[PDB]
Design an enzyme around this catalytic site. Structure first.
Site, mmCIF file in Angstrom:
data_model
loop_
_atom_site.group_PDB
_atom_site.id
_atom_site.type_symbol
_atom_site.label_atom_id
_atom_site.label_comp_id
_atom_site.label_asym_id
_atom_site.label_seq_id
_atom_site.Cartn_x
_atom_site.Cartn_y
_atom_site.Cartn_z
ATOM 1 N N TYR B 159 0.800 -1.228 0.000
ATOM 2 C CA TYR B 159 0.000 0.000 0.000
ATOM 3 C C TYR B 159 0.834 1.281 0.000
ATOM 4 O O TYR B 159 0.306 2.371 -0.232
ATOM 5 C CB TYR B 159 -0.956 0.011 1.212
ATOM 6 N N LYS B 229 1.745 -14.435 5.412
ATOM 7 C CA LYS B 229 2.219 -15.456 4.476
ATOM 8 C C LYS B 229 3.746 -15.513 4.589
ATOM 9 O O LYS B 229 4.484 -15.313 3.610
ATOM 10 C CB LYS B 229 1.769 -15.140 3.044
ATOM 11 N N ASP B 282 -3.440 -18.094 3.585
ATOM 12 C CA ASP B 282 -4.366 -18.859 2.754
ATOM 13 C C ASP B 282 -5.190 -19.807 3.625
ATOM 14 O O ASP B 282 -6.409 -19.887 3.493
ATOM 15 C CB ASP B 282 -3.668 -19.600 1.593
HETATM 16 MG MG LIG Z 1 -1.758 -22.192 -0.637
#
Ligand SMILES: [Mg+2]
Ligand SMILES: Nc1ncnc2c1ncn2[C@@H]1O[C@H](COP(=O)(O)O)[C@@H](O)[C@H]1OP(=O)(O)O
Ligand SMILES: Nc1ncnc2c1ncn2[C@@H]1O[C@H](COP(=O)(O)O)[C@@H](O)[C@H]1OP(=O)(O)O
Ligand SMILES: NC(=O)c1ccc[n+]([C@@H]2O[C@H](COP(=O)(O)O)[C@@H](O)[C@H]2O)c1
Ligand SMILES: NC(=O)c1ccc[n+]([C@@H]2O[C@H](COP(=O)(O)O)[C@@H](O)[C@H]2O)c1
Ligand SMILES: [Mg+2]
Lengths: 415, 415
Positions: B159, B229, B282
């Site tokens: 951002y 992540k 995820d």
């Molecule tokens: Mg994945």
């Protein structure tokens, strides 16, 4: 010295003019996978062999050839051999391969082995179809409305692995270049700051979207949706969207619907109009829950695809049975999409559905559609029968609990 | 010349020792918002005034002061005035403000006005609570299990807006620096390639996580989950996670649970053990559907927070009634979280629930908890009554269709 054994009976699949030439006795490399790989892979081999035997009455047979990556590779090849060069060579040479889940070690500064396989082999399509199997327990009211196919770009984005640690000499150097040479003033806190680089290219984008559109045509799908956060990331995600629409116009005759921006592409085989449209990524995660029926083929970048494929799998109750392929121009690697779940490893307990359905994709990729159809039919019947593994059984009433191996047999029983 | 009118009756909120000093007659700046802002903002003003009047028996009253940003700003201040400097000054000066949705123009190379407000004012917390209101139509089976509070980092990540267009001189220069000076070999296609930069800092991370933990303590919440992540983006997302756990240990007495990595933090007020844990992003988008009850306070980076707050809002049937705040150390700006929906603008049709519930957050922020509680009670009763706007009504049977203004009245009727 190689510890791989090339099957005595069996022949190599070949590639001519972008078309696979599959013999009746193809050699298929497989990676067993770590953790629950020991459970799901044997189930997969048995189910695939049965579907192939039933479909072609013994005329065709896969010669399975074990190859290595992950924890097992270290046990075979030695200490620091997590991904042997031989494995990359063999997948490329034999054209089609399948793998269970992989253990990537932590603390040794090595990056995801799944991603390494994808990038090294240039498997630029992560193909993840998400459909509902009637009878599957789902957290949503209408999972049957979900029938989508994810084309996730697999070679670029922040997955490139280009980044430097906070306070490292490299990071400070990059930050200095950015502020002093590029005149960047937007870094809120330039000290103790990690930096990552996000690339997105015209060639990378277009080869991915090209495949998505060809798939929509080949399979008479209704639309391709470009999902992106291009309103914030104008030159990466926004460029992905623009290049995708441009490719549709330039290669597929895409024409403006009304005042745009959506396009229509005429299916040259069925005459059906395929809609090319786009949705911003945050809103898309809402749309797949609220208006799933409006979506079909999805084309998106690496990280967005990671998220979308997981979110979709969860909603159809398919967290442990989601199939996946990694496809490039020279070879393809099909994969279990769940993790290694080491707590259950060797207990013959977990759901082999994911790797079995990736094997379905593999058979279809080989043009063995009859065998692939038998797996789908088998999977449908076994789930409908409520004869299932613990992960489904615990969410249902009146189900019969099966072991992993036993669920494999149930699939065969329903072919 | 300023076109803002400072209310004759009313006093400025002040800040002393990180504590707001709110007079009985506070001046509150508000931005009407573009598109359906014209519909929802008046509903908000009426509902807030009623809650304040009822709660404090006329002793307290907000002096609303209109200020400008977006399309309306151009109509007031002139041609290219989308965000007047005065608006930044006034929000900072008056400490607490609220806005409807904003139109950011396309084609003029200007970036999101919402993001500009957040960054310019250093409102580093995007605070988005997501709960279920009984009677709301939802696409999921058990929306009542969702009761989470999102602390989304608001000042860094991709951002930052640091990026260069494919084929531009700047991009080629950055790419050259990367390949030639940094020895980067991981860019798959270096030609016709857009580039974006993703920063994540220790200071940026820790101020966000610090706020999340203080919130869990202040509100006796059960856990804080760091979502990231970090297995792919080690030095940005992974660093976020590591710094978050470190902050918990260093400032809040966090201690290892079993063999880790989860920590327990003792609530110094109630003695409750707050769990500090982490989930990969995820998988987290699956977990919020499959095990919503296990999650409470969420701390995450900018882009992940964007996605998570939308996904959560959709599942509780709250796409059009999701509240949001942007909070910094010197001021705070509450916001409608939906878009401008220009097709319905001026029709008194859309749901004012989002901006009303952001106003609830605003009242609570001001320490006017009684008035805030009345809005919650009103909202609960109106929805339970099935007296609702078209977006709910069309998904229900036996509901009474209300206009936007009328739903505002229904909320007041149920206080
Ligand atoms: Mg994945
Ligand atoms: N094939 C599968 N069948 C059933 N559950 C699975 C499967 N794959 C993963 N899981 C779930 O994911 C977890 C493994 O996570 P990972 O490998 O990503 O570290 C398991 O604990 C299990 O959930 P659960 O333990 O609640 O039964
Ligand atoms: N407050 C609201 N009440 C009802 N629907 C809303 C609201 N805000 C946004 N929407 C939906 O989002 C759309 C506006 O999108 P945007 O402003 O992001 O471009 C509208 O079409 C509407 O859906 P719909 O048209 O299906 O009724
Ligand atoms: N013909 C088109 O291009 C088309 C059609 C329907 C929706 N949309 C998109 O959906 C959004 C709203 O569309 P509606 O006209 O259905 O409300 C717009 O952002 C638009 O981009 C586009
Ligand atoms: N005490 C802990 O740190 C703790 C407890 C439960 C789960 N977890 C996390 O959840 C995952 C699996 O946990 P389980 O032991 O519940 O299967 C692991 O990745 C672990 O990091 C951690
Ligand atoms: Mg958003």
């Amino acid at each position: 010295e190689s510890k791989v054994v090339v099957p005595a009976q069996g022949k190599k699949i070949t590639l001519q003019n972008g078309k696979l030439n599959v013999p009746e006795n193809p050699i298929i490399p497989y990676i067993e996978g770590d953790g629950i790989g020991v459970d799901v892979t044997p189930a997969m081999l048995k189910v695939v062999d049965a579907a192939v035997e039933k479909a072609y009455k013994g005329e065709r047979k896969i010669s399975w050839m074990e190859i290595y990556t992950g924890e097992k590779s270290t046990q075979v090849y030695g200490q620091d051999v997590w991904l042997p060069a031989e494995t990359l060579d063999l997948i490329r040479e034999y054209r089609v391969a399948i793998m269970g889940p992989l253990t990537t070690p932590v603390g040794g500064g090595i990056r995801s082995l799944n991603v390494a396989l994808r990038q090294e082999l240039d498997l630029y399509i992560c193909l993840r179809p998400v459909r509902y199997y009637q009878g599957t327990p789902s957290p949503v009211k209408h999972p049957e409305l979900t029938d989508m196919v994810i084309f996730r770009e697999n070679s670029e984005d922040i997955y490139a692995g280009i980044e430097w640690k906070a306070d490292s000499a490299d990071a400070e150097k990059v930050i200095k270049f950015l502020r002093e040479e590029m005149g960047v003033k937007k870094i809120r806190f330039p000290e103790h700051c990690g930096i990552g680089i996000k690339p997105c290219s015209e060639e990378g984008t277009k080869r991915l979207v090209r495949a998505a559109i060809e798939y929509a045509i080949a399979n008479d799908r209704d639309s391709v949706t470009l999902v992106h956060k291009g309103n914030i990331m104008k030159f990466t995600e926004g460029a992905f969207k623009d290049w995708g629409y441009q490719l549709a116009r330039e290669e597929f005759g895409g024409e403006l619907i009304d005042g745009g921006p959506w396009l229509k592409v005429k299916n040259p085989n069925t005459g059906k109009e395929i809609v090319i449209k786009d949705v911003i990524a945050d809103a898309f995660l809402q749309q797949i829950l609220l208006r799933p029926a409006e979506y079909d083929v999805i084309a998106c970048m690496n990280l967005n695809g990671d998220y979308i494929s997981d979110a979709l799998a969860a909603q159809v109750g398919g967290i442990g049975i989601a199939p996946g392929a990694n496809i490039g121009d020279e070879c393809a690697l099909f994969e279990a999409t769940h993790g290694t779940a080491p707590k259950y490893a060797g207990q013959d307990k977990v759901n082999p559905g994911s790797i079995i359905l990736s094997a379905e994709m593999m058979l279809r990729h080989m043009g063995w559609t009859e065998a692939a159809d038998l797996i789908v039919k088998g999977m449908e019947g076994a789930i409908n029968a409520k004869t299932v593994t613990y992960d489904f059984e615990r969410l249902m009433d009146g189900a019969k609990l099966l072991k992993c191996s036993e669920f494999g047999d149930a699939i065969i029983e329903n072919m």
